[PDB]
Curated annotation (Swiss-Prot), chain A:
Biological process, per Gene Ontology: synaptic vesicle lumen acidification
Protein name listed in UniProt: V-type proton ATPase subunit F
A Pfam family that the UniProt record links to this protein: ATP-synt_F
Family named by the database record: Belongs to the V-ATPase F subunit family.
Recorded topology in the membrane: Peripheral membrane protein
Subcellular locations according to the entry: Cytoplasmic vesicle, Secretory vesicle, Synaptic vesicle membrane; Cytoplasmic vesicle, Clathrin-coated vesicle membrane
Keywords from the UniProt entry: Cytoplasmic vesicle, Hydrogen ion transport, Ion transport, Membrane, Synapse, Transport
GO molecular function, one term: proton-transporting ATPase activity, rotational mechanism
Superkingdom, natural source: Eukaryota
Purpose of the protein: Subunit of the V1 complex of vacuolar(H+)-ATPase (V-ATPase), a multisubunit enzyme composed of a peripheral complex (V1) that hydrolyzes ATP and a membrane integral complex (V0) that translocates protons. V-ATPase is responsible for acidifying and maintaining the pH of intracellular compartments and in some cell types, is targeted to the plasma membrane, where it is responsible for acidifying the extracellular environment.
Name of the gene encoding the protein in the UniProt record: Atp6v1f
Cellular component terms (Gene Ontology): ATPase complex; clathrin-coated vesicle membrane; proton-transporting V-type ATPase complex; proton-transporting V-type ATPase, V1 domain; synaptic vesicle membrane; vacuolar proton-transporting V-type ATPase, V1 domain
Cystines in this chain: none
From Swiss-Prot, chain B:
Name of the protein in question: V-type proton ATPase catalytic subunit A
Taxonomic source organism: Mus musculus
Superkingdom to which the source organism belongs: Eukaryota
Assembly and binders: V-ATPase is a heteromultimeric enzyme made up of two complexes: the ATP-hydrolytic V1 complex and the proton translocation V0 complex. The V1 complex consists of three catalytic AB heterodimers that form a heterohexamer, three peripheral stalks each consisting of EG heterodimers, one central rotor including subunits D and F, and the regulatory subunits C and H. The proton translocation complex V0 consists of the proton transport subunit a, a ring of proteolipid subunits c9c'', rotary subunit d, subunits e and f, and the accessory subunits ATP6AP1/Ac45 and ATP6AP2/PRR.
Signal sequence range: none
Curated annotation (Swiss-Prot), chain C:
GO terms for cellular component: ATPase complex; centrosome; cilium; clathrin-coated vesicle membrane; extrinsic component of synaptic vesicle membrane; nucleoplasm; plasma membrane; proton-transporting V-type ATPase complex
Keyword Membrane: yes
Name listed for the protein in its UniProt record: V-type proton ATPase subunit D
Keyword field: Cell projection, Cilium biogenesis/degradation, Cytoplasm, Cytoplasmic vesicle, Cytoskeleton, Hydrogen ion transport, Ion transport, Membrane, Transport
Organismal lineage: Eukaryota, Metazoa, Chordata, Craniata, Vertebrata
The protein's assembly and partners: V-ATPase is a heteromultimeric enzyme made up of two complexes: the ATP-hydrolytic V1 complex and the proton translocation V0 complex. The V1 complex consists of three catalytic AB heterodimers that form a heterohexamer, three peripheral stalks each consisting of EG heterodimers, one central rotor including subunits D and F, and the regulatory subunits C and H. The proton translocation complex V0 consists of the proton transport subunit a, a ring of proteolipid subunits c9c'', rotary subunit d, subunits e and f, and the accessory subunits ATP6AP1/Ac45 and ATP6AP2/PRR. Interacts with SNX10.
GO terms of molecular function: proton-transporting ATPase activity, rotational mechanism
Function: Subunit of the V1 complex of vacuolar(H+)-ATPase (V-ATPase), a multisubunit enzyme composed of a peripheral complex (V1) that hydrolyzes ATP and a membrane integral complex (V0) that translocates protons. V-ATPase is responsible for acidifying and maintaining the pH of intracellular compartments and in some cell types, is targeted to the plasma membrane, where it is responsible for acidifying the extracellular environment. May play a role in cilium biogenesis through regulation of the transport and the localization of proteins to the cilium.
Protein topology in the membrane: Peripheral membrane protein
Signal sequence residues: none
Amino acid sequence: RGKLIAVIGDEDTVTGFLLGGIGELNKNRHPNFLVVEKDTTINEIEDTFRQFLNRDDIGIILINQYIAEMVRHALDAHQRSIPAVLEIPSKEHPYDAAKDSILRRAKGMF
Amino acid sequence: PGGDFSDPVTSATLGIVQVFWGLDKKLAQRKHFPSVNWLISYSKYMRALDEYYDKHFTEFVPLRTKAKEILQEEEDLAEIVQLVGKASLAETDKITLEVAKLIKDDFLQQNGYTPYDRFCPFYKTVGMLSNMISFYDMARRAVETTAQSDNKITWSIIREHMGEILYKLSSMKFKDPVKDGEAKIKADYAQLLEDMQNAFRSLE
Amino acid sequence: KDRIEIFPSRMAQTIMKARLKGAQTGRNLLKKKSDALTLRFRQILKKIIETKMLMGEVMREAAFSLAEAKFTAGDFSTTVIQNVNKAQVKIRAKKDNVAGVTLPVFEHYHEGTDSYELTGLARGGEQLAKLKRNYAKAVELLVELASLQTSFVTLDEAIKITNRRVNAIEHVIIPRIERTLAYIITELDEREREEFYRLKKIQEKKKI
């Protein structure tokens, strides 16, 4: 009841994840999700990502490889546990095991 | 000189004297009079006095043994529990630490300037130790039973149930022998023990 | 700096012996704690890669079913995005005492909100229900992965703290006290020797 998963993804991923059930309107009635497209500037994405992270009632964040790669420094600038950030594959961007913040914290184990 | 044992008088006298009641400087800087070390002191007279005890009371020895075990166990625990921030204590460890601290505060510390501490008779100490040990024993057994079965009992539920009886036990210190009679104190402690049992049954 | 400060005396020898013994016992204790932490680290970082590859497989299935949903009914994505008022699965914040330290975890919680009915666009209920079930599974599995990686990201700070403490106890505190013990024993031997020479010379004079 406390925290709610977030979603920053293209139309396919966000429709699929919203059909999974997640997504609520907050006090400002902003959406729990964001729409990313080819017609979506970097500044909007970065500002929305920080907006979500500042809304402490979210807790979990879902971002694919590509969106995170676009704002890579803003992704790896975050080292905290409770506001978890997830790196997931995508049909349009299948996972690369060499690219994860958590495995970068674990880099050197092999 | 300096409180140590290297001085020849200390070494010579320690090999002759049947009982030793050494003092600790730090505890005297705490003004925790009487300032006894409680870990180096000894007495080679327990066995001889067991016969005398078993003629009148027959119940002092188990209480003395259990109290000494609690105190020594806490003395072992202290630095170890300090090393880990005093966070990862099992239930038995927590009851041991708290009960030992309370015992040091109340049942091992006095000054005669009050009428209730100038002389603690044998029966008064017997009752004090008896009820304190019964409290510790029943808390430990309450923990153990539900730890084996289900719903591990913490100190919190016992406090929430019977803090009144717990502080009735804490206040046995000040049952003044100058004013209260011997029968008054004995019956008071017995009533508090019966209420200990009944409250713990109510919690069950 | 190099040596503890205390006057050479036999009580000081016993006291520094006690200090060294306490240091050694704390050393051993924190090594055992570090061993437990390293074992926990290894068994939580065992096959997270395999869990994530399984997630890849699951969402391959999900993308295929999404393509099927696009195929049979045509266009409902905008209606899904348009109507978003309240969620259907939330998270119950929790903590996990894997060891002496605590590590955050999370729990999937079925809030139970009713799903939007798709019956107008070619009566696409069965296929949308299939996609709903697929993503219902995906949500729970990714909550499990989220708990795992949250605890894993938390553990490292405690690991580093424990390692630095053990290393300091092994590098700084012990050699200093050992050097002090050498200094105090040799100084006490010197002083007993001076008294001995004094006694020798007085008996020499007493020979007269």
